[PDB]
């Protein structure tokens, strides 16, 4: 068979990767120009959202130290890939949980529909990377929002879920926080209510 | 914004580490029991972000003035980012971090007793050139201690993250030293079962780059997933 | 008063560098152009100082604490001094110098653009136990270029003196780390015919002599001329 | 043949011998107890003497950064290994040339007459070993005296050397320093005039 | 009372036999999933019981005549224990039980049809000497079938237990005979993954210690974890 | 690197480990000495107490073939390494479980404090070894008492267990059995409050 | 390490270089356009001046076979790289030695400063790659001014020369031929006043 350069290999993020990816949350003098948890700016076009969760391991213990990349079309279901602090609206971002705060928090706008290869909407969701300690490859999931159970229920993507209990594990949990929309979203790395992760 | 004109050649996910390596006891309780689930690509695992516009420093990628001197050995890490067409992959961001010549992180957490360095911050990022091309300026990093086995220390690393063209290819990865004895002991470097994938993470020394009287030069090439035009779909 | 009881095995100076070695162009001057003159061994060659009585300071060995810490890896180099008929060299003076971890040296004459440590001054000695074992406690010390060719480094390394029971058995030697990717580069190195006697020089990482959660261990054995005693002379 | 284990391979001193093995003469502070240069303190028995010289490279040029190590008898032809700073005379001692002195000085006393195995008496040496940059393995020669040419002329080590003028090269040129009777003793590595070096 | 002046070369768990090992049924239940703590060494477990008080019987170490004679293979078990670095370990208890010729056990639990030996029970203890060695006399046991596979039959083999010098060195053990063909085929010795690892629990024939016309006798060295004094502390 | 020899590799102890050592508990005639439960005599110093527990495996099964073995500092923080049965007191016992008997027992005294390598005290404890059928290479753990948590809570052994939780699975039960002070300790191999084993 | 290809490796030049590259020194028909000693026309700025020498072989015997290439910058202390037989100036020439006229000759303009890459100024020079039948690869040299002691004194190029013995081979003398100022520079390939080759 034909066969290719193969790939760099994977490795964890391990347990400092604040200090590379997250200055800040790490509590290092950050630079000029930062990759961080705010996907918009409060004049960006969208529903501000504010994204939450904690992630536990297989012992139902927080992770205190995850790295995450979020991915997201903007508003319009497009993915603004010309990153820019200048931009009132970044696709990327990252956040991340620590010993400080085990919980991440994302600010950012609800991400419009995309279509799959096929033509195929798929719900709005934000693809999420995680990365920490203890993770060879880095996870990919998706966080899909429990306002978008009619969307949630046709996506190609969340379909191919084979287990319905386990698409579940996909599903931000809407809340408030000071009056803002917030989204729970606690990833289950293991065991019970174990979290869909992707290969693509 | 972003298109959706590229496919990814499959991980090989033999080739990468498992998510379930018990001698690494913190991917234990990390990694996932149930199967992942495989999708076909869409414009939301094909597309990724363009950092051309961040404003780099103009120290960013220099380790040696973005934080006095740091105290380490001096060399410039440079490669390219190529993917497994062996197409290079231009104005993609490279980010590093590692520790400090006694490896020691400037992070809280890190009670290893190695000092800081007051001049050390050990954290870079760089935009490959239209050739592919990226490089770093920083000191070698030094190996440290792990609460893992009773007597676990990873080999000295620069921790690598690469975007790339998307969010399919961007990983991250730690970049090992052409001949450090630790590699084959460590239970993170043995996440991966195959020896030739670990030969990939090997940076080699390259005298060619180096400044003769200043620093020297480590060629760490990446590849990331070939990229292909998508064909018949 | 020290006796001639003993003869040491004579030296292998095919296994040694030779004087001449046009690469590392030092050497091409201070070289001797005539021949060796062979000599056979007496007291005065086959005895030396017993450093027993000198009062090291309570860190003589530890680089650690001798001159805040020093910044770089924290290593024990450990080893044990033998003969070459392998009994072992107690009591011996085993001094080592070397570079901080970024490849300076605390002398005047060492311009090299790396800093100084304020906390690491690289001087150490010890004296080997009942058993010829001796053990230092520094920091790995980075490669530095110097003015050879015009792209010349030095693999880390670190100095060594062994005293040995006598002058005949006196070396100044070089450590070097297990795997140093320069180490085959070396014109200093290279100065070394047989890739066997450089393996030699090669200390061996040693994690049964690490202290978890502290320090990494090498162990480089030195082997001194193997004395025997006289027979029917 | 029976080969045993071999020997460690020698390796130069490099340029900053001085730091490890000359902290004074590098200029660098010094510990309780250093090895140096005088042998003899004031009331050792013997005469005392200065020993001084220069070493050149092959092109005529000072070396300025040699250290050497003697190891000699005492006044009595004692080698004196057990080294300590109370004593009177130690036997052994180091010394060295810089940037700053270009010549090196050893105070001790001129040495007794050591037999050599088989019996035969040895000219007063100082047994030295030079070690610098440039010199893989140390040299070893003799600094014999210009004032004992008589026993110069039986050493059994001197007779060795088979061209007569070469033997010239290892006798001190005594002289006398601040009314200090000294020796001079010039090492010439390579070229006219080059030192002899001896393997044992 | 103890102190806490050793410390003890970290098991490699690579070489043991895992705690999950399939084939070998039982391990399925009775092994953790959480990875081990590692925690240092610290007075606990850098000491352990002395057996040198233990009052030992006569006939204690000799299972020919500690319950006529027993029918079956007379042999000898000798061999001595060491520690990683080659070194002895003196008055440690080494204590072993295995089956009658037939394969049959003296416990209530044991069914097996081959019936028990009116002058067998099959259990002996053994202090070290002074160089490690201990030694027991015996019949060989027979291979016996067990409930693992439906035709699995353990290798003849004894089972020993050796305290060392801590509880840090403290193990249980199996030893097996040379040639026997069932030895490949045991999932219990197929628990340890290094077929290297493997030939370690092998007894081998040792014409040389037999006594002639009378019993065989089987070599069998135990290694026990390294000890080292503490440095740097 | 360097490599030493490798350790003898381990075994299970298989079912039969009873008639080798614990052999009463065997219900095989018993030798003169043996190494027993019985870890103090009545008179000696220190709090007398009863210890017992049960084993299971991850079935929650209980383990009726385990063997343990304890080690432990008498009243005073002191390790009592020299066994002997006319001892008052013994660091050193081993119990079992079996068919007949499910529950293990020990007779001892709660052990005094202990300091850590660094000097820092440990909360008294008891260490623990067990062996089984089905246990490849034994497992380490260590009994703290639940009547010393001030101790118990800066123990710096304890304080590497990063998870609170994981602590608690170390720690015995205080109680009483016919009025007696005891403690328990059970220990699940496998599963649900899987307890703590250590490597070291 | 990264390995490149490996450049062509050097031959000497051997006996006929002058066919191939000093035509008219060979005597054989030139063609229009030849490369040769005539850096300067009459009408180039700077001061005009004539180098002129010889070159010794290791027995100090003349190289009538050798072959000589410059390269200087202008009065100004600039590089002209384009070559050009026009240019009133060109920052290049060859010149050989033959059997006919043993002495170089080149015709051309004291060279200006020009800043090593430090930043700091070297004094005036010309660069010099000499080739001929025995070099197996060709060597590089310097010319430099004598009456430009001020300069030279600071080149950090010279002064990279450990022995200031062995900076002034690279001085040329001044001098007038036809009361044209003159500057003779005499290379010494191998021996005594051995010019100083680099290695760049
Ligand atoms: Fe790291
Ligand atoms: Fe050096
Ligand atoms: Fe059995
Ligand atoms: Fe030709």
Chains 1, 4, 6, 7 share one sequence.
Not at chain 1, 59 to 64: A, D, T
């Amino acid at each position: 068979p034909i066969e290719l350069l193969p790939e760099t290999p994977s490795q964890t993020a391990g347990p400092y990767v604040h200090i590379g990816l997250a200055l800040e949350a790490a509590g290092n003098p950050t630079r000029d120009q930062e990759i961080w948890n705010r996907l918009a700016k409060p004049d960006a076009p969208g529903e501000h959202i504010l994204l939450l969760g904690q992630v536990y391991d297989g012992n139902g213990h927080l992770v205190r130290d995850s790295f995450l990349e979020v991915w997201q079309a903007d508003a319009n279901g497009e993915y603004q890939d010309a990153y820019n602090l200048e931009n009132a609206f970044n696709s990327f971002g990252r956040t991340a949980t620590t010993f400080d705060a085990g919980e991440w928090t994302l600010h950012t706008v609800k991400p419009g529909v995309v279509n799959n290869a096929a033509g195929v909407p798929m719900a709005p969701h934000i693809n999420i990377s995680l990365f920490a300690r203890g993770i060879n490859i880095h996870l990919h999931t998706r966080l899909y929002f429990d306002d978008e159970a009619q969307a949630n229920a046709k996506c190609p993507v969340l379909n191919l879920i084979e287990q319905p209990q386990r698409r579940e594990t996909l599903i931000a949990k809407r809340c408030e926080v000071d009056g803002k929309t917030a989204y729970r979203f606690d990833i289950r790395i293991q065991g019970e209510g174990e979290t869909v992760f992707f290969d693509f | 914004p972003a298109q959706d004109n590229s496919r990814f050649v499959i991980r090989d996910r033999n080739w990468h580490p498992k998510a379930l390596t018990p001698d690494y006891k913190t991917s234990i309780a990390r990694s996932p029991r149930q199967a992942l689930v495989s999708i076909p690509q869409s414009i939301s695992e094909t597309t990724g972000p363009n950092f051309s516009h961040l404003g780099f420093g103009a120290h960013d990628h220099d380790l040696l003035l973005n934080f006095g001197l740091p105290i380490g050995e001096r060399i410039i890490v440079a490669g390219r980012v190529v993917d497994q067409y062996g197409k290079p992959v231009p104005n993609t961001l490279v980010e590093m971090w590692q520790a400090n010549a006694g490896g020691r992180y400037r992070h809280k957490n890190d009670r290893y007793l190695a000092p800081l360095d007051p001049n050390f911050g050990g954290v870079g990022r760089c935009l490959t050139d239209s050739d592919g091309y990226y490089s770093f300026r920083t000191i070698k990093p030094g190996p440290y201690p792990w609460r893992n086995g009773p007597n676990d220390w990873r080999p000295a690393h620069i921790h690598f993250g690469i975007s790339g063209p998307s969010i399919a290819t961007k990983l991250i990865t730690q970049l090992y030293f052409e001949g450090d004895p630790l590699i084959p002991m460590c239970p993170i470097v043995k996440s991966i079962a195959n020896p030739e994938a670990v030969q990939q993470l090997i940076a080699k020394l390259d005298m060619n780059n180096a400044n003769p009287m200043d620093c020297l030069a480590y060629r760490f090439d990446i590849v990331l997933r070939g990229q292909r035009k998508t064909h018949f779909e």
